[PDB]
Amino acid sequence: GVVEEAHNVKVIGSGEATIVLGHGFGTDQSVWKHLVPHLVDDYRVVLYDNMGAGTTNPDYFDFDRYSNLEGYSFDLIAILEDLKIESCIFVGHSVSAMIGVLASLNRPDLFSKIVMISASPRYVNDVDYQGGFEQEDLNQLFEAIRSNYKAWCLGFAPLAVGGDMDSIAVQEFSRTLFNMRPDIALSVGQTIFQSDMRQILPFVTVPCHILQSVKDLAVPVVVSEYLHANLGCESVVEVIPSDGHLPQLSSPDSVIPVILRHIRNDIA
Numbered sequence: 001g002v003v004e005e006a007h008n009v010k011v012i013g014s015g016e017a018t019i020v021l022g023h024g025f026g027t028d029q030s031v032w033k034h035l036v037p038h039l040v041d042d043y044r045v046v047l048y049d050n051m052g053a054g055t056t057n058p059d060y061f062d063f064d065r066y067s068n069l070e071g072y073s074f075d076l077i078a079i080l081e082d083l084k085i086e087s088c089i090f091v092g093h094s095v096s097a098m099i100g101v102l103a104s105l106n107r108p109d110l111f112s113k114i115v116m117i118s119a120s121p122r123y124v125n126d127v128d129y130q131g132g133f134e135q136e137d138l139n140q141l142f143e144a145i146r147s148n149y150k151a152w153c154l155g156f157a158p159l160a161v162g163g164d165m166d167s168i169a170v171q172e173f174s175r176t177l178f179n180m181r182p183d184i185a186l187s188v189g190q191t192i193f194q195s196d197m198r199q200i201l202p203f204v205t206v207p208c209h210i211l212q213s214v215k216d217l218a219v220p221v222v223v224s225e226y227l228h229a230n231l232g233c234e235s236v237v238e239v240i241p242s243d244g245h246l247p248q249l250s251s252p253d254s255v256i257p258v259i260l261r262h263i264r265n266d267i268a
C-alpha cells in the first residue's frame with residue numbers, strides 16, 4: 001500500500017489497545033528502539049516515519065502540504081485510517097507532539113490520549129513567552145545549514161542529544177540528521193522553528209501527558225508549564241531528571257520507566 005510504503009509503517013505487538021509512535025525532526029522511527037520492547041507484549045504498536053525524514057523518498061516531499069504542521073497531521077490520520085485503527089494512544093516526540101495535537105483537533109475520536117516528549121507550541125520568545133530562541137539564533141542556525149550542512153549536523157547533534165559528545169545516541173542522531181536531503185532539512189527546520197500552536201491549545205479535548213528533560217536545548221522547562229496551563233484538556237506534567245532532546249534514545253534507563261508510567265496509567 002502507498003501510505004504504508006511512503007512512511008515505512010511497521011505494525012508489531014499484540015493487545016487490546018494500539019500505541020502509535022511519532023518521531024521528531026532529524027531522527028526516524030529508530031528513536032523508539034528502547035521503548036518498543038516494553039510495549040510489544042501488551043499493545044499493538046505502530047511505527048512510522050514523517051515525510052521528509054532521511055528514510056523517506058525526497059520525491060514525495062510535497063512543499064505545499066508540509067508548509068504547515070497540519071500536512072503531517074493529515075498523514076498521521078491517513079495512516080490510522082489505512083490500518084482501520086479507530087482509537088490509539090499517541091506518543092509524539094518533539095514536532096510529533098504538535099502534529100498529534102493538530103491531528104486530535106481534526107479527529108479527536110482517533111485518540112484516547114497523547115503522551116508528549118520534548119514538546120513545544122512555540123520556540124521563539126514572545127512578549128510574556130519564553131520559547132528558548134530569539135529570531136537571531138534561528139537565523140544563524142539556517143545560515144549554518146545553507147553554508148555547510150555536513151558541519152552543521154556534526155556540531156548540532158551533540159548539543160541536541162546532550163550528555164557525552166561521543167555517545168552512541170550522538171552518533172545515531174548525527175547520522176539520521178545527515179541522511180536528510182539538505183534542502184528539505186532547511187525547509188522543514190524553518191517550518192517547525194517558525195510554528196506557533198499557542199492559539200489552538202485551549203480547544204484540545206484529548207487528555208495530554210507532557211514529558212521533557214529538565215535540560216533540553218530546544219525546550220525550556222517553562223514550556224511544559226505553558227502547555228499544561230493552556231491546553232483545554234485534562235493534562236499532567238512530568239519533568240524528568242535527564243539531559244537531551246531525544247531522552248528516550250540517550251538515557252533510556254531513567255526515561256523509559258517515566259514514558260511507560262504515562263502510557264500505562266490515565267489521568268484521574
Ligand SMILES: [Cl-]
Binds near residue numbers: 111
Ligand atoms: Cl477521544
Ligand code: NA
Binds near residue numbers: 231235
Ligand atoms: Na490542561
